[model samples]
Target: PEIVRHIVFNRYKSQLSQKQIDQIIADYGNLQNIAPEMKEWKWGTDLGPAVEDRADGFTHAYESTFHSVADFLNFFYSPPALEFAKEFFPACEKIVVLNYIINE
Candidate 1:
Protein backbone atom coordinates (compact mmCIF):
# COMPACT_ATOMS: atom_id res chain seq x y z
CA PRO A 1 0.00 0.00 0.00
CA GLU A 2 1.14 3.57 -0.71
CA ILE A 3 1.76 5.82 2.24
CA VAL A 4 3.21 9.07 3.57
CA ARG A 5 4.99 9.43 6.90
CA HIS A 6 4.49 12.35 9.19
CA ILE A 7 7.10 13.05 11.86
CA VAL A 8 6.56 14.85 15.11
CA PHE A 9 9.29 15.97 17.53
CA ASN A 10 8.45 17.39 20.89
CA ARG A 11 9.97 18.82 24.05
CA TYR A 12 7.81 18.86 27.13
CA LYS A 13 7.75 21.37 29.95
CA SER A 14 10.39 20.96 32.65
CA GLN A 15 7.79 20.92 35.39
CA LEU A 16 6.10 17.68 34.29
CA SER A 17 7.12 14.54 36.18
CA GLN A 18 8.08 11.26 34.47
CA LYS A 19 4.69 9.82 35.38
CA GLN A 20 2.94 12.77 33.79
CA ILE A 21 5.03 12.33 30.69
CA ASP A 22 4.10 8.68 30.48
CA GLN A 23 0.41 9.43 30.85
CA ILE A 24 0.41 12.09 28.16
CA ILE A 25 2.36 9.86 25.82
CA ALA A 26 -0.15 7.10 26.41
CA ASP A 27 -3.02 9.40 25.52
CA TYR A 28 -1.63 9.89 22.04
CA GLY A 29 -2.81 6.39 21.16
CA ASN A 30 -6.36 7.60 21.35
CA LEU A 31 -5.68 9.71 18.28
CA GLN A 32 -6.62 6.68 16.22
CA ASN A 33 -10.26 7.15 17.14
CA ILE A 34 -10.12 10.86 16.39
CA ALA A 35 -8.32 10.64 13.07
CA PRO A 36 -9.44 7.65 11.14
CA GLU A 37 -7.33 8.80 8.23
CA MET A 38 -4.18 7.80 10.09
CA LYS A 39 -2.94 4.38 9.02
CA GLU A 40 -0.28 3.72 11.66
CA TRP A 41 1.29 5.57 14.58
CA LYS A 42 4.10 5.12 17.08
CA TRP A 43 6.15 7.26 19.39
CA GLY A 44 8.93 7.03 21.94
CA THR A 45 11.14 8.96 24.30
CA ASP A 46 14.85 9.49 23.69
CA LEU A 47 16.05 6.92 26.18
CA GLY A 48 19.70 7.87 25.77
CA PRO A 49 18.76 11.43 26.47
CA ALA A 50 20.85 11.75 23.31
CA VAL A 51 21.88 15.36 23.37
CA GLU A 52 20.52 18.15 25.47
CA ASP A 53 17.21 19.35 24.15
CA ARG A 54 17.56 22.74 22.53
CA ALA A 55 14.44 23.70 24.42
CA ASP A 56 15.90 22.38 27.66
CA GLY A 57 13.02 19.95 28.20
CA PHE A 58 12.34 16.23 27.80
CA THR A 59 12.45 15.20 24.15
CA HIS A 60 10.13 12.71 22.50
CA ALA A 61 8.79 12.00 19.05
CA TYR A 62 5.92 10.51 17.12
CA GLU A 63 5.69 9.09 13.63
CA SER A 64 2.63 8.09 11.67
CA THR A 65 1.84 7.09 8.11
CA PHE A 66 -1.21 8.05 6.14
CA HIS A 67 -2.58 7.41 2.68
CA SER A 68 -1.78 10.95 1.62
CA VAL A 69 -0.79 14.37 2.86
CA ALA A 70 -4.41 15.33 2.55
CA ASP A 71 -5.30 12.59 4.98
CA PHE A 72 -2.80 13.97 7.44
CA LEU A 73 -4.12 17.45 6.84
CA ASN A 74 -7.56 16.21 7.76
CA PHE A 75 -6.12 14.90 11.01
CA PHE A 76 -4.37 18.19 11.64
CA TYR A 77 -7.55 20.16 11.13
CA SER A 78 -9.98 17.75 12.70
CA PRO A 79 -11.97 18.70 15.77
CA PRO A 80 -10.46 15.83 17.69
CA ALA A 81 -6.94 17.00 16.95
CA LEU A 82 -7.72 20.51 18.13
CA GLU A 83 -9.29 19.18 21.28
CA PHE A 84 -6.37 16.88 21.84
CA ALA A 85 -3.93 19.72 21.40
CA LYS A 86 -5.73 21.76 24.02
CA GLU A 87 -4.87 19.08 26.54
CA PHE A 88 -1.51 18.02 25.15
CA PHE A 89 -0.05 21.45 24.63
CA PRO A 90 -0.01 22.18 28.34
CA ALA A 91 2.61 19.50 28.87
CA CYS A 92 4.66 20.55 25.87
CA GLU A 93 6.78 23.64 25.77
CA LYS A 94 8.30 23.15 22.34
CA ILE A 95 7.46 20.99 19.36
CA VAL A 96 8.16 20.46 15.68
CA VAL A 97 6.39 18.45 12.98
CA LEU A 98 7.52 17.39 9.54
CA ASN A 99 6.11 15.19 6.78
CA TYR A 100 7.65 13.39 3.82
CA ILE A 101 7.03 10.69 1.23
CA ILE A 102 9.01 7.48 1.46
CA ASN A 103 10.54 5.99 -1.64
CA GLU A 104 11.99 2.54 -1.96
Candidate 2:
Protein backbone atom coordinates (compact mmCIF):
# COMPACT_ATOMS: atom_id res chain seq x y z
CA PRO A 1 0.00 0.00 0.00
CA GLU A 2 1.08 3.57 -0.66
CA ILE A 3 1.01 5.41 2.62
CA VAL A 4 -0.29 8.95 2.46
CA ARG A 5 -0.13 11.99 4.67
CA HIS A 6 -2.80 14.64 4.73
CA ILE A 7 -1.56 18.06 5.80
CA VAL A 8 -3.54 21.15 6.69
CA PHE A 9 -2.43 24.65 7.58
CA ASN A 10 -4.91 27.10 8.99
CA ARG A 11 -5.20 30.84 9.39
CA TYR A 12 -7.96 31.77 11.78
CA LYS A 13 -10.08 34.89 11.93
CA SER A 14 -9.16 37.77 14.22
CA GLN A 15 -12.68 37.64 15.70
CA LEU A 16 -12.04 34.28 17.36
CA SER A 17 -10.63 34.39 20.88
CA GLN A 18 -7.49 32.42 21.69
CA LYS A 19 -9.50 30.05 23.84
CA GLN A 20 -11.89 29.26 21.02
CA ILE A 21 -9.00 28.90 18.61
CA ASP A 22 -7.21 26.46 20.87
CA GLN A 23 -10.42 24.54 21.35
CA ILE A 24 -10.71 24.15 17.61
CA ILE A 25 -7.27 22.56 17.65
CA ALA A 26 -8.35 20.20 20.39
CA ASP A 27 -11.38 19.26 18.37
CA TYR A 28 -9.17 18.46 15.39
CA GLY A 29 -6.91 16.24 17.45
CA ASN A 30 -9.84 14.15 18.61
CA LEU A 31 -10.86 13.20 15.09
CA GLN A 32 -8.36 10.36 15.11
CA ASN A 33 -10.48 8.55 17.69
CA ILE A 34 -13.80 9.81 16.38
CA ALA A 35 -13.09 8.52 12.90
CA PRO A 36 -10.79 5.69 13.95
CA GLU A 37 -9.54 5.15 10.41
CA MET A 38 -6.27 7.02 10.39
CA LYS A 39 -2.99 5.31 11.19
CA GLU A 40 -1.57 8.35 12.98
CA TRP A 41 -2.09 12.06 13.32
CA LYS A 42 -0.28 15.02 14.80
CA TRP A 43 -0.75 18.76 15.20
CA GLY A 44 1.09 21.92 16.25
CA THR A 45 0.97 25.66 16.32
CA ASP A 46 3.57 27.53 14.28
CA LEU A 47 7.00 28.16 15.83
CA GLY A 48 8.42 31.01 13.78
CA PRO A 49 9.24 33.04 16.88
CA ALA A 50 12.08 30.84 18.02
CA VAL A 51 13.33 29.92 14.57
CA GLU A 52 12.18 33.10 12.71
CA ASP A 53 10.17 33.65 9.50
CA ARG A 54 8.38 31.68 6.72
CA ALA A 55 5.25 30.60 8.55
CA ASP A 56 3.31 32.89 6.17
CA GLY A 57 0.52 33.66 8.67
CA PHE A 58 -0.60 30.04 8.93
CA THR A 59 -0.74 29.59 12.68
CA HIS A 60 -1.44 25.89 12.99
CA ALA A 61 -0.51 22.74 11.09
CA TYR A 62 -2.03 19.26 11.28
CA GLU A 63 -0.95 16.02 9.73
CA SER A 64 -2.83 12.72 9.39
CA THR A 65 -1.38 9.44 8.19
CA PHE A 66 -3.35 7.03 6.00
CA HIS A 67 -2.88 3.62 4.48
CA SER A 68 -3.30 5.03 0.98
CA VAL A 69 -4.91 7.77 -1.09
CA ALA A 70 -8.28 6.05 -0.82
CA ASP A 71 -7.97 6.00 2.95
CA PHE A 72 -7.38 9.74 2.93
CA LEU A 73 -10.56 10.26 0.92
CA ASN A 74 -12.49 8.02 3.28
CA PHE A 75 -11.48 10.11 6.26
CA PHE A 76 -12.16 13.36 4.47
CA TYR A 77 -15.76 12.52 3.61
CA SER A 78 -16.50 10.52 6.73
CA PRO A 79 -19.30 11.54 9.07
CA PRO A 80 -16.80 12.41 11.78
CA ALA A 81 -15.29 15.03 9.51
CA LEU A 82 -18.70 16.51 8.75
CA GLU A 83 -19.37 16.92 12.44
CA PHE A 84 -15.93 18.40 13.04
CA ALA A 85 -16.19 20.71 10.04
CA LYS A 86 -19.25 22.47 11.46
CA GLU A 87 -17.03 24.59 13.69
CA PHE A 88 -13.66 24.03 12.08
CA PHE A 89 -14.52 25.44 8.67
CA PRO A 90 -16.19 28.59 9.95
CA ALA A 91 -13.40 29.51 12.37
CA CYS A 92 -10.74 29.68 9.73
CA GLU A 93 -10.06 32.69 7.52
CA LYS A 94 -8.24 30.41 5.10
CA ILE A 95 -6.89 26.87 4.88
CA VAL A 96 -4.33 24.92 2.93
CA VAL A 97 -4.83 21.20 2.43
CA LEU A 98 -2.37 18.90 0.73
CA ASN A 99 -1.74 15.19 0.48
CA TYR A 100 1.39 13.30 -0.46
CA ILE A 101 2.57 9.72 -0.62
CA ILE A 102 5.04 8.60 2.01
CA ASN A 103 7.55 6.41 0.25
CA GLU A 104 9.41 5.71 3.44
Candidate 3:
Protein backbone atom coordinates (compact mmCIF):
# COMPACT_ATOMS: atom_id res chain seq x y z
CA PRO A 1 0.00 0.00 0.00
CA GLU A 2 1.06 3.62 -0.63
CA ILE A 3 0.22 6.85 1.12
CA VAL A 4 0.40 10.61 0.71
CA ARG A 5 -0.10 12.87 3.66
CA HIS A 6 -1.82 16.27 3.62
CA ILE A 7 -1.45 19.05 6.08
CA VAL A 8 -4.36 21.42 5.78
CA PHE A 9 -4.94 24.46 7.92
CA ASN A 10 -8.55 25.38 8.33
CA ARG A 11 -10.37 28.10 10.19
CA TYR A 12 -14.06 27.87 10.82
CA LYS A 13 -15.98 31.13 10.74
CA SER A 14 -18.27 32.01 13.59
CA GLN A 15 -21.07 32.89 11.23
CA LEU A 16 -20.70 29.50 9.54
CA SER A 17 -24.04 27.82 9.37
CA GLN A 18 -24.91 24.16 9.70
CA LYS A 19 -26.61 24.51 6.36
CA GLN A 20 -23.31 25.42 4.79
CA ILE A 21 -21.45 22.49 6.32
CA ASP A 22 -24.25 20.17 5.40
CA GLN A 23 -24.26 21.51 1.88
CA ILE A 24 -20.57 20.91 1.54
CA ILE A 25 -21.03 17.37 2.76
CA ALA A 26 -23.92 16.86 0.45
CA ASP A 27 -21.88 17.87 -2.57
CA TYR A 28 -18.51 16.29 -1.74
CA GLY A 29 -20.13 13.28 -0.21
CA ASN A 30 -18.63 12.29 3.16
CA LEU A 31 -15.49 11.04 4.83
CA GLN A 32 -15.93 7.78 2.98
CA ASN A 33 -15.58 9.57 -0.33
CA ILE A 34 -11.94 10.30 0.48
CA ALA A 35 -10.60 6.78 -0.16
CA PRO A 36 -12.33 6.46 -3.52
CA GLU A 37 -11.30 9.69 -5.26
CA MET A 38 -8.66 8.92 -7.91
CA LYS A 39 -7.02 12.25 -7.43
CA GLU A 40 -6.74 11.75 -3.73
CA TRP A 41 -3.10 11.62 -2.73
CA LYS A 42 -4.10 9.10 -0.11
CA TRP A 43 -7.24 9.38 1.92
CA GLY A 44 -8.63 9.98 5.42
CA THR A 45 -9.13 7.43 8.11
CA ASP A 46 -9.42 7.48 11.89
CA LEU A 47 -6.51 9.90 12.02
CA GLY A 48 -7.12 12.48 14.72
CA PRO A 49 -6.42 16.20 14.75
CA ALA A 50 -2.74 17.03 14.39
CA VAL A 51 -3.26 20.30 16.23
CA GLU A 52 -6.06 22.40 17.65
CA ASP A 53 -6.40 25.12 15.01
CA ARG A 54 -4.95 28.12 16.81
CA ALA A 55 -6.50 30.63 14.48
CA ASP A 56 -9.11 33.33 15.07
CA GLY A 57 -11.63 30.58 14.64
CA PHE A 58 -11.85 26.79 14.76
CA THR A 59 -9.13 25.42 12.52
CA HIS A 60 -8.46 21.83 11.38
CA ALA A 61 -6.59 19.81 8.82
CA TYR A 62 -7.28 16.87 6.52
CA GLU A 63 -4.37 14.43 6.73
CA SER A 64 -5.43 12.64 3.61
CA THR A 65 -3.40 10.50 1.22
CA PHE A 66 -3.79 8.96 -2.20
CA HIS A 67 -2.60 5.71 -3.70
CA SER A 68 0.22 7.54 -5.42
CA VAL A 69 1.69 10.90 -6.29
CA ALA A 70 0.11 10.79 -9.72
CA ASP A 71 -3.28 10.31 -8.20
CA PHE A 72 -2.65 13.20 -5.89
CA LEU A 73 -1.52 15.46 -8.70
CA ASN A 74 -4.44 14.41 -10.80
CA PHE A 75 -6.73 15.50 -7.99
CA PHE A 76 -5.57 19.10 -8.27
CA TYR A 77 -6.04 19.35 -12.01
CA SER A 78 -9.38 17.63 -12.19
CA PRO A 79 -12.49 19.70 -12.78
CA PRO A 80 -15.03 20.26 -10.07
CA ALA A 81 -12.23 19.28 -7.71
CA LEU A 82 -11.26 22.86 -7.06
CA GLU A 83 -14.89 23.82 -6.78
CA PHE A 84 -15.66 20.80 -4.68
CA ALA A 85 -12.65 21.70 -2.56
CA LYS A 86 -14.09 25.14 -2.01
CA GLU A 87 -17.36 23.56 -1.08
CA PHE A 88 -15.61 20.84 0.93
CA PHE A 89 -14.67 23.13 3.72
CA PRO A 90 -17.42 25.65 4.19
CA ALA A 91 -17.53 27.82 7.24
CA CYS A 92 -13.82 27.82 6.55
CA GLU A 93 -12.43 31.28 7.13
CA LYS A 94 -8.97 30.23 5.98
CA ILE A 95 -7.09 27.22 4.60
CA VAL A 96 -3.56 26.06 3.77
CA VAL A 97 -2.96 22.99 1.64
CA LEU A 98 0.27 21.04 2.02
CA ASN A 99 1.61 17.69 0.80
CA TYR A 100 3.88 15.07 2.36
CA ILE A 101 5.19 11.58 1.65
CA ILE A 102 5.13 9.13 4.52
CA ASN A 103 8.12 6.77 4.85
CA GLU A 104 7.08 5.32 8.14
Candidate 4:
Protein backbone atom coordinates (compact mmCIF):
# COMPACT_ATOMS: atom_id res chain seq x y z
CA PRO A 1 0.00 0.00 0.00
CA GLU A 2 3.07 2.23 0.38
CA ILE A 3 1.54 3.60 3.53
CA VAL A 4 3.28 4.32 6.80
CA ARG A 5 2.15 3.90 10.35
CA HIS A 6 3.39 6.08 13.15
CA ILE A 7 2.90 4.27 16.41
CA VAL A 8 3.30 5.85 19.82
CA PHE A 9 3.51 4.34 23.28
CA ASN A 10 3.33 6.39 26.43
CA ARG A 11 4.07 5.57 30.05
CA TYR A 12 2.40 8.34 31.96
CA LYS A 13 3.71 9.94 35.12
CA SER A 14 2.52 8.65 38.47
CA GLN A 15 -1.01 9.37 39.68
CA LEU A 16 -2.32 10.64 36.36
CA SER A 17 -6.08 10.51 36.53
CA GLN A 18 -8.42 8.70 34.13
CA LYS A 19 -10.02 12.04 33.32
CA GLN A 20 -6.65 13.45 32.34
CA ILE A 21 -5.99 10.47 30.13
CA ASP A 22 -9.37 10.95 28.46
CA GLN A 23 -8.50 14.53 27.72
CA ILE A 24 -5.16 13.44 26.34
CA ILE A 25 -6.91 11.00 24.06
CA ALA A 26 -9.22 13.68 22.77
CA ASP A 27 -6.46 16.17 22.17
CA TYR A 28 -4.21 13.55 20.59
CA GLY A 29 -7.00 12.33 18.37
CA ASN A 30 -7.74 15.88 17.34
CA LEU A 31 -4.53 15.89 15.34
CA GLN A 32 -5.98 13.37 12.94
CA ASN A 33 -9.13 15.39 12.63
CA ILE A 34 -7.21 18.47 11.65
CA ALA A 35 -4.69 16.76 9.43
CA PRO A 36 -5.96 15.99 5.97
CA GLU A 37 -3.05 13.68 5.30
CA MET A 38 -3.47 11.57 8.41
CA LYS A 39 -5.59 8.78 6.94
CA GLU A 40 -6.38 6.79 10.10
CA TRP A 41 -6.05 7.04 13.88
CA LYS A 42 -6.64 4.71 16.78
CA TRP A 43 -5.63 4.33 20.43
CA GLY A 44 -5.83 2.01 23.40
CA THR A 45 -5.16 1.93 27.15
CA ASP A 46 -3.07 -0.82 28.68
CA LEU A 47 -4.33 -3.74 30.75
CA GLY A 48 -2.08 -5.65 33.11
CA PRO A 49 -0.78 -9.23 32.81
CA ALA A 50 2.43 -11.12 32.18
CA VAL A 51 4.26 -9.57 29.20
CA GLU A 52 1.93 -6.65 29.69
CA ASP A 53 2.52 -3.02 30.59
CA ARG A 54 3.82 -4.08 34.00
CA ALA A 55 7.30 -4.36 32.55
CA ASP A 56 7.32 -1.60 29.96
CA GLY A 57 4.81 0.56 31.89
CA PHE A 58 3.34 2.25 28.86
CA THR A 59 -0.14 3.35 29.82
CA HIS A 60 -1.49 3.99 26.35
CA ALA A 61 -0.78 3.38 22.69
CA TYR A 62 -1.69 5.42 19.61
CA GLU A 63 -1.33 4.81 15.92
CA SER A 64 -1.61 7.19 13.01
CA THR A 65 -1.54 6.12 9.39
CA PHE A 66 -0.35 8.28 6.54
CA HIS A 67 -0.04 7.89 2.83
CA SER A 68 3.70 8.36 2.84
CA VAL A 69 6.72 9.27 4.95
CA ALA A 70 6.52 12.92 3.87
CA ASP A 71 2.92 13.12 4.98
CA PHE A 72 3.80 11.63 8.34
CA LEU A 73 6.70 14.01 8.86
CA ASN A 74 4.60 16.99 7.91
CA PHE A 75 1.92 16.00 10.35
CA PHE A 76 4.45 15.35 13.14
CA TYR A 77 5.96 18.83 12.77
CA SER A 78 2.73 20.66 12.10
CA PRO A 79 1.92 23.52 14.48
CA PRO A 80 -1.04 21.86 16.13
CA ALA A 81 0.94 18.64 16.44
CA LEU A 82 3.80 20.48 18.09
CA GLU A 83 1.32 21.98 20.47
CA PHE A 84 -0.05 18.57 21.30
CA ALA A 85 3.41 17.13 21.90
CA LYS A 86 4.37 19.96 24.25
CA GLU A 87 1.49 19.13 26.56
CA PHE A 88 1.47 15.39 25.92
CA PHE A 89 5.12 14.64 26.69
CA PRO A 90 5.04 16.47 30.03
CA ALA A 91 2.28 14.16 31.25
CA CYS A 92 4.29 11.06 30.36
CA GLU A 93 7.31 9.58 32.12
CA LYS A 94 8.33 7.69 28.99
CA ILE A 95 7.44 7.51 25.32
CA VAL A 96 8.37 5.20 22.44
CA VAL A 97 7.73 5.77 18.76
CA LEU A 98 7.92 3.76 15.57
CA ASN A 99 7.32 4.72 11.96
CA TYR A 100 7.41 2.04 9.35
CA ILE A 101 6.29 1.55 5.79
CA ILE A 102 3.97 -1.34 4.99
CA ASN A 103 5.56 -3.95 2.76
CA GLU A 104 2.57 -6.15 2.09
Candidate 4 on 1-104: residue-level lDDT in tens?
A: 47998889888887889799789888888876788888778988777675554636777788888998888888888998889888898998999999899876
When summed lDDT is taken over every stretch of 10 residues in candidate 1, the lowest stretch is: 49-58
Off by over 4 Å in 3: 29-58, 88-91
Per-residue lDDT over 1-104 for candidate 1, one digit per residue giving the tens place of the 0 to 100 score = 55789888888888989898888777787788667897678987776535554534546789888998788788889988887788787777888877888889
TM of each candidate vs. truth:
0.77, 0.88, 0.60, 0.86
Q: Which candidate comes out best when scored by lDDT?
A: 2
Which residue runs does candidate 2 get wrong by more than 4 Å?
none
Q: How should the candidates be ordered by lDDT, best one leading? A: 2, 4, 1, 3
For each candidate in the order shown, give its overall lDDT on alpha carbons.
0.79, 0.85, 0.58, 0.83
The collision pairs in model 3 are 41-65, 41-66, 42-65, 42-66, 43-65
Model 2 TM-score, 2 decimals: 0.88
Instruction: Kindly give the number of clashing pairs for every candidate.
Output: 0, 0, 5, 0
In terms of lDDT, model 4 sits at 0.83
Give the Å shift of residue 40 in candidate 2. Answer: 2.0
| Order of quality (TM-score) | 2, 4, 1, 3
